[PDB]
Amino acid sequence: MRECISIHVGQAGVQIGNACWELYCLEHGIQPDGQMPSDKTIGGGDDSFNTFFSETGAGKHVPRAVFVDLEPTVIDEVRTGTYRQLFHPEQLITGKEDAANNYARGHYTIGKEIIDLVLDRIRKLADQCTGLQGFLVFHSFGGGTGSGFTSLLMERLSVDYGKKSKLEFSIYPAPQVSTAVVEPYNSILTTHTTLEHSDCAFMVDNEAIYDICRRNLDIERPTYTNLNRLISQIVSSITASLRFDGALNVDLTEFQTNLVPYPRIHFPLATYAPVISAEKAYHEQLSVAEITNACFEPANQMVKCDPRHGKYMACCLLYRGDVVPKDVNAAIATIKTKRSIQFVDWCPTGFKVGINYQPPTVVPGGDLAKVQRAVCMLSNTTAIAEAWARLDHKFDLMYAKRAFVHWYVGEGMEEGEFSEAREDMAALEKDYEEVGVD
Amino acid sequence: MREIVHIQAGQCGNQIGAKFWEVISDEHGIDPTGSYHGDSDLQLERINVYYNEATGNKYVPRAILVDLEPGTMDSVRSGPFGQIFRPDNFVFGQSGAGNNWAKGHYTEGAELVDSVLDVVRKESESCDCLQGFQLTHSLGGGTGSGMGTLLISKIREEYPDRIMNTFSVMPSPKVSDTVVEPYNATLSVHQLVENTDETYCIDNEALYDICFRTLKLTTPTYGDLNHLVSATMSGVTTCLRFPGQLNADLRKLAVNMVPFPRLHFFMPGFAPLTSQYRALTVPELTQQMFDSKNMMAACDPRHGRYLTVAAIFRGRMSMKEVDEQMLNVQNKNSSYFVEWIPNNVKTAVCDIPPRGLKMSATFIGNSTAIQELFKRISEQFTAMFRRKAFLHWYTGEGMDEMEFTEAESNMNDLVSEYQQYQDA
Amino acid sequence: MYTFVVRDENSSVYAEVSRLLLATGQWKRLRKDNPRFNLMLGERNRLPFGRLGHEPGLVQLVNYYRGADKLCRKASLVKLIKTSPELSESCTWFPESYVIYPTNLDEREVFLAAYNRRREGREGNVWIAKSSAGAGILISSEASELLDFIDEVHVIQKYLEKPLLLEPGHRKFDIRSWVLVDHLYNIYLYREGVLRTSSEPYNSADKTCHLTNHCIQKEYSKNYGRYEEGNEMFFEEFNQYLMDALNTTLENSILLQIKHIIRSCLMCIEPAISTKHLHYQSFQLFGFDFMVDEELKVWLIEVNGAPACAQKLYAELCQGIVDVAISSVFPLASIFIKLHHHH
Amino acid sequence: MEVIELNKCTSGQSFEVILKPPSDPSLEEIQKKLEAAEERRKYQEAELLKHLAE
Numbered sequence A: 001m002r003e004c005i006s007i008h009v010g011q012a013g014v015q016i017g018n019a020c021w022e023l024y025c026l027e028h029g030i031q032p033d034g035q036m037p038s039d040k041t042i043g044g045g046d047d048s049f050n051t052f053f054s055e056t057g058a059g060k061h062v063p064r065a066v067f068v069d070l071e072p073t074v075i076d077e078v079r080t081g082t083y084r085q086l087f088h089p090e091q092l093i094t095g096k097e098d099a100a101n102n103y104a105r106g107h108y109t110i111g112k113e114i115i116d117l118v119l120d121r122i123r124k125l126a127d128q129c130t131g132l133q134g135f136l137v138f139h140s141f142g143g144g145t146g147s148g149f150t151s152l153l154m155e156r157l158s159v160d161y162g163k164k165s166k167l168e169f170s171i172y173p174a175p176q177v178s179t180a181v182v183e184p185y186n187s188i189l190t191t192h193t194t195l196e197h198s199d200c201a202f203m204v205d206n207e208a209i210y211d212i213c214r215r216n217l218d219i220e221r222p223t224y225t226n227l228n229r230l231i232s233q234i235v236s237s238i239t240a241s242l243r244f245d246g247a248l249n250v251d252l253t254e255f256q257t258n259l260v261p262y263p264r265i266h267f268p269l270a271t272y273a274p275v276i277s278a279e280k281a282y283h284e285q286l287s288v289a290e291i292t293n294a295c296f297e298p299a300n301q302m303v304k305c306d307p308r309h310g311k312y313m314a315c316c317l318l319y320r321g322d323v324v325p326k327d328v329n330a331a332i333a334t335i336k337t338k339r340s341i342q343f344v345d346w347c348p349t350g351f352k353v354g355i356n357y358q359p360p361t362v363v364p365g366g367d368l369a370k371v372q373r374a375v376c377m378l379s380n381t382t383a384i385a386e387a388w389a390r391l392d393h394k395f396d397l398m399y400a401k402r403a404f405v406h407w408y409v410g411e412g413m414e415e416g417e418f419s420e421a422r423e424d425m426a427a428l429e430k431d432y433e434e435v436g437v438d
Numbered sequence B: 001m002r003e004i005v006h007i008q009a010g011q012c013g014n015q016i017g018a019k020f021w022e023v024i025s026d027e028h029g030i031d032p033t034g035s036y037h038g039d040s041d042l043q044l045e046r047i048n049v050y051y052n053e054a055t056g057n058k059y060v061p062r063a064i065l066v067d068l069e070p071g072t073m074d075s076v077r078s079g080p081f082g083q084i085f086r087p088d089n090f091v092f093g094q095s096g097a098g099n100n101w102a103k104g105h106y107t108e109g110a111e112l113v114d115s116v117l118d119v120v121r122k123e124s125e126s127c128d129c130l131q132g133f134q135l136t137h138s139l140g141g142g143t144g145s146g147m148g149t150l151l152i153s154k155i156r157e158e159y160p161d162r163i164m165n166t167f168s169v170m171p172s173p174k175v176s177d178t179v180v181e182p183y184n185a186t187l188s189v190h191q192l193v194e195n196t197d198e199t200y201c202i203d204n205e206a207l208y209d210i211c212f213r214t215l216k217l218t219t220p221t222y223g224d225l226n227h228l229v230s231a232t233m234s235g236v237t238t239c240l241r242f243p244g245q246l247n248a249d250l251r252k253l254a255v256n257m258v259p260f261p262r263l264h265f266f267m268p269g270f271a272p273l274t275s276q277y278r279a280l281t282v283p284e285l286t287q288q289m290f291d292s293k294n295m296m297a298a299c300d301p302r303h304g305r306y307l308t309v310a311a312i313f314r315g316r317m318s319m320k321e322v323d324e325q326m327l328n329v330q331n332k333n334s335s336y337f338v339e340w341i342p343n344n345v346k347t348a349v350c351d352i353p354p355r356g357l358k359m360s361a362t363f364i365g366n367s368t369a370i371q372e373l374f375k376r377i378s379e380q381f382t383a384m385f386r387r388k389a390f391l392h393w394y395t396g397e398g399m400d401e402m403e404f405t406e407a408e409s410n411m412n413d414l415v416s417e418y419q420q421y422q423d424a
Numbered sequence C: 001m002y003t004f005v006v007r008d009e010n011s012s013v014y015a016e017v018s019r020l021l022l023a024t025g026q027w028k029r030l031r032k033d034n035p036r037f038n039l040m041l042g043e044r045n046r047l048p049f050g051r052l053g054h055e056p057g058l059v060q061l062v063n064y065y066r067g068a069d070k071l072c073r074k075a076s077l078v079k080l081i082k083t084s085p086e087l088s089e090s091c092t093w094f095p096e097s098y099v100i101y102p103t104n105l106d107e108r109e110v111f112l113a114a115y116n117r118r119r120e121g122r123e124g125n126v127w128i129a130k131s132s133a134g135a136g137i138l139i140s141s142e143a144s145e146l147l148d149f150i151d152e153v154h155v156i157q158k159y160l161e162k163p164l165l166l167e168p169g170h171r172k173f174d175i176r177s178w179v180l181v182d183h184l185y186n187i188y189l190y191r192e193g194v195l196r197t198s199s200e201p202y203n204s205a206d207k208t209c210h211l212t213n214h215c216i217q218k219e220y221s222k223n224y225g226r227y228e229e230g231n232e233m234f235f236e237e238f239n240q241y242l243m244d245a246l247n248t249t250l251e252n253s254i255l256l257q258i259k260h261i262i263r264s265c266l267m268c269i270e271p272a273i274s275t276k277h278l279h280y281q282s283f284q285l286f287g288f289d290f291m292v293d294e295e296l297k298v299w300l301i302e303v304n305g306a307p308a309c310a311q312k313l314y315a316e317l318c319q320g321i322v323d324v325a326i327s328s329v330f331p332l333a334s335i336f337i338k339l340h341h342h343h
Numbered sequence D: 001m002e003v004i005e006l007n008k009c010t011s012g013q014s015f016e017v018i019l020k021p022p023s024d025p026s027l028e029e030i031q032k033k034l035e036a037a038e039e040r041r042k043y044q045e046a047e048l049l050k051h052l053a054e
């Protein structure tokens, strides 16, 4: 058994972390007080769920998690929430003044003052690990803490844990749910300095989650609570292989092996189905073929783009519920005949499939309806580069006028870091085009 | 615990500042004696932003009252909510400033400024994490204009990394006390260009026209004009005082509104403005909020382009309907928003409406059309300065003509900086 | 009040469409870089499809189908027909074609394999080489001249040695059909076509009487505008000729095959380009070019993704574009033949 | 359509289906950048204090 440490940075990272750990407890039968009746090895053990939960002699199952924010009001929700008993104060780190949506403030000004405290609290968790796999890092692109402090933390984690893997869950900025304007700056600044430090990053566009909540859950104005419940379901499907018995994606290294042939192109597209409103008293349960076909509908992707006009490098299908391999292969054969699935020439045209028999768990009283089977597809397609092109274009519009740049220079940043980051994104956009276009 | 320190200076600054504390004390359920008497915990959640909690569950405004005359601050202490202010926070002289920027900034005000900073320091010391400062004042007089900008400069010296926002009343010949108002305003504007992060430009001409043309008041008073200012000040601070969609501090708010450091002068607006029981629909709130008649800077937004726009809606209303109306307004004004700042129109909501309104909307525009206000002040300045008219009131306090020449050049530069982004 | 942007100034078709939209008083034109549009009349090259459908609360529509170049390129069309089971290599209405990459960079040996079968069997062995980089076209019966001309990506297809020749004149022609595909992938064939006719007599033994291009007939042909105005014969006259000369109609002898070919091509690429469940919607106007042999068999020549129109038909067609392709998505306050199909 | 590497357990199973064969900076350097940015901050603040002192 090899442990994983989750790190949640900024408001988006903390609130999504809170949603994920709540769902983890519901999936593993862990009560809010930390007790797990089905766990018979009291005070220890090396089961699959112990990769995410340590155990005290009293029987409490403590998440291997660190929460970091430069302002306390969001983490104070964790301190006084339903699952407050899971965590001890050493795991919850708060500053007094946030980064004000300013990357330079999170990376340089405020980050320099708290980075050693965070690394010490992380070291405390790593000391409980007999064989640490690495880290899962949750953060937004747009926040000053989520962008600025995360990239600083990722730099130091590569220094202090050079052999460990690091995976990201990153919230891509969407104007419909954002009250900020400088997020293209923060997103490109943080992607530039984190790129060489992340092995595999799962981007979640808030635009996509927003429209899925409106379309499939009939929520007129989705809230962050609605968005994070849906996101935690996708994250859970991605990490379920680390927490349950299985043979696919059983350690963090396998994510890069199965999904990332070229290290810079490490942003797999996630697609999830089915998302069914809980207000529907009775909904017809979709078959394996129907949920698998839904994995190739852009309306179900975590990032809106067109995989028909790109090329795949890898594809992983992660099923939960009543699914047998025969039905999976029958759906794949039908999909190949009807869908535009083009792989690159230097990769096999295939699908790695994982099936976990436990059906998806939903939060009681939530908006997601219980379903008999669900699938999350992880595909490394060049089509996700459309998300970089959109972001880089908004960057170019503002930076040509140096709009808002003085806020960053005022915190010690140089203007050369802007163009250095932008040139790295230009090379990234060119890498995708060389791989996926003839 | 993100505290704001409030300062009000001079006649206009103290009269509008007093109304602001009357309005928000009512919104938070604080009575004229500092005792809470509300019916919602939402009123006390962010009460610490503007109020200090004392013994016996008493809430004391974090407000400092400054003047060079005792007259207006005696009216405040005898006003409705006069007893709620901390007695030690009344800092005043006796000589006055004679509507003279030099007296407030260089002679009379310099003698009093240190004792004001002692009160500012005492209030800052008891702040868990100070957000920043806000100042209410006029620019056409001597105390609020001259000593107010002197205070801002000394606050930036002692608190260089703290936000400084102002509500600044611009003079107009329509609503004028002395002829030297363009002199005082031109000298003060350059101070604000350097030492504030947000300045809400409240034009007394616009306030007058709204009371006359819209509210149908044939003879408006300062009390009528100040009613518009209290309602606007309450609307722009709603996101700081009540829980809701926004939980941004002053710095984050300024970061997303100010793309260039010197262009931080905002055109405020408010809706509804009714002369009264009819329910105002969301299309009506949104259309009036962007109408020039509801603007308080007396600038035509169609004569420039918006760098950034913020709109804060208060009350229980349909957000889907609000989003639809904001889309339609942006289509009608598509040519009046810069295209090089994506998504530069932002909307926010708070569920608690003001006193006496089912719903309201507050407008904050960072528009290049504000250069019309600085052009107006600049022409009136030059009309007198070319003949050195009334200058002896200032040279008699030690000022030189060169300082006026430099203030004139500083504002022509500010006007030109707005013009370069209007063409881009 | 709808908003639209114009990003192709050289489009004679959509310059009229933009003119009609403004004339309704309900469409406001924006600057070419304003992202807050309802409709984009996009550019031909590198249209940024990846930035469409991301403005909150805006239904966005573009006048080009992403991926439709597969049909509107010389080498792409040949590969699309040979590799698609719906069309197959046994396609009966497309001339036997081959993709030939120049030697300074493929189907060279396969082209010569079928070439030797025609030379041996006394059959007509005339081919034609062309590419998308043309105004440069070579027609020859010797395979050596064809492969050497390409080296100086091209396609070599069988030259239709037995074309239907109009009388009087003994002259070659081609049929241009305009097809509009809307956002629901309805296929609308414009009722009016044009015959771009050659004014020189066809000589089976000089490229003026073999290439029916409107620019070649106006630059290198001395009989331009003799029989018909601008070498453009419309369907009414051509139908009247087919009845008098061949005792048949345009609908029976030709138009049934044309409608069949348009449907086959567009239904083939429908899963690859449809915007049915996409965050933005597309429509596009296509120009199909056909050839008719002496047996009244219709052959597909090429498909134009950015076609112009005939001067007499600009007003009618552009109004139809606003009607079924634009106002169907953005309603205000038939000249087409709908080719029905199964989605 | 070949299925390979089928692994089964009580809580699920996994396999792979092939449709077609194919055709860091040191802690020192990070401290240098953090301190260089803090020095530019100190320099800009000192110029402000100098400007205010004048």
Ligand SMILES: Nc1nc2c(ncn2[C@@H]2O[C@H](COP(=O)(O)OP(=O)(O)OP(=O)(O)O)[C@@H](O)[C@H]2O)c(=O)[nH]1
Binding pocket: A009, A010, A011, A012, A013, A015, A016, A069, A070, A098, A099, A100, A101, A102, A106, A140, A141, A142, A143, A144, A145, A146, A147, A171, A172, A173, A174, A177, A178, A179, A183, A206, A224, A227, A228, A231
């Ligand atoms: N999906 C989701 N997105 C969020 C959530 N909270 C914030 N965001 C997004 O994150 C971006 C804002 O960054 P934040 O994470 O709030 O800021 P931060 O990381 O705390 O950094 P600061 O600037 O110091 O506050 C916006 O694009 C929001 O839409 C959340 O709970 N769920």
Ligand SMILES: Nc1ncnc2c1ncn2[C@@H]1O[C@H](COP(=O)(O)OP(=O)(O)CP(=O)(O)O)[C@@H](O)[C@H]1O
Binding pocket: C095, C128, C130, C134, C135, C157, C158, C159, C160, C161, C172, C173, C174, C210, C211, C212, C213, C289, C291, C301, C302, C304
């Ligand atoms: N296989 C073939 N047999 C006979 N004629 C042919 C032919 N291929 C092409 N042509 C002739 O070539 C002419 C135009 O060729 P082509 O269509 O490749 O040029 P082009 O694409 O520039 C015209 P457009 O402007 O419609 O795109 C037609 O008039 C047609 O008569």
Ligand SMILES: Nc1nc2c(ncn2[C@@H]2O[C@H](COP(=O)(O)OP(=O)(O)O)[C@@H](O)[C@H]2O)c(=O)[nH]1
Binding pocket: B009, B010, B011, B012, B013, B015, B016, B097, B098, B099, B100, B138, B139, B140, B141, B142, B143, B144, B145, B169, B170, B171, B172, B175, B176, B177, B181, B204, B207, B222, B223, B225, B226
């Ligand atoms: N809106 C408003 N403007 C005022 C008020 N009192 C004065 N003014 C304006 O402020 C300017 C005079 O400055 P004032 O504040 O009286 O001088 P000070 O005491 O030296 O600061 C003139 O332009 C007046 O029109 C007021 O109560 N409300």
Ligand SMILES: c1ccc(Oc2ccc3nc(NCc4ccco4)[nH]c3c2)cc1
Binding pocket: A179, B004, B133, B134, B165, B166, B198, B236, B237, B239, B240, B246, B250, B253, B254, B257, B310, B311, B312, B346, B347, B348, B364
């Ligand atoms: C999204 C995001 C923000 C929105 O509204 C804003 C924007 C900028 C603002 N600045 C202030 N400062 C008021 C103040 C306090 C002390 C002195 O002045 N309030 C603001 C509100 C609307 C939508």
Ligand SMILES: [Ca+2]
Binding pocket: A039, A040, A041, A042, A043, A044, A045, A055
């Ligand atoms: Ca155990």
Ligand SMILES: [Ca+2]
Binding pocket: A158, A162, A196, A197, D024
């Ligand atoms: Ca590494």
Ligand SMILES: [Ca+2]
Binding pocket: B111
């Ligand atoms: Ca004295």
Ligand SMILES: [Mg+2]
Binding pocket: A010, A011, A071, A098, A143, A145
């Ligand atoms: Mg935050």
Ligand SMILES: [Mg+2]
Binding pocket: B011, B012, B141, B177
């Ligand atoms: Mg006065």
Ligand SMILES: [Mg+2]
Binding pocket: C302, C304
């Ligand atoms: Mg062509």
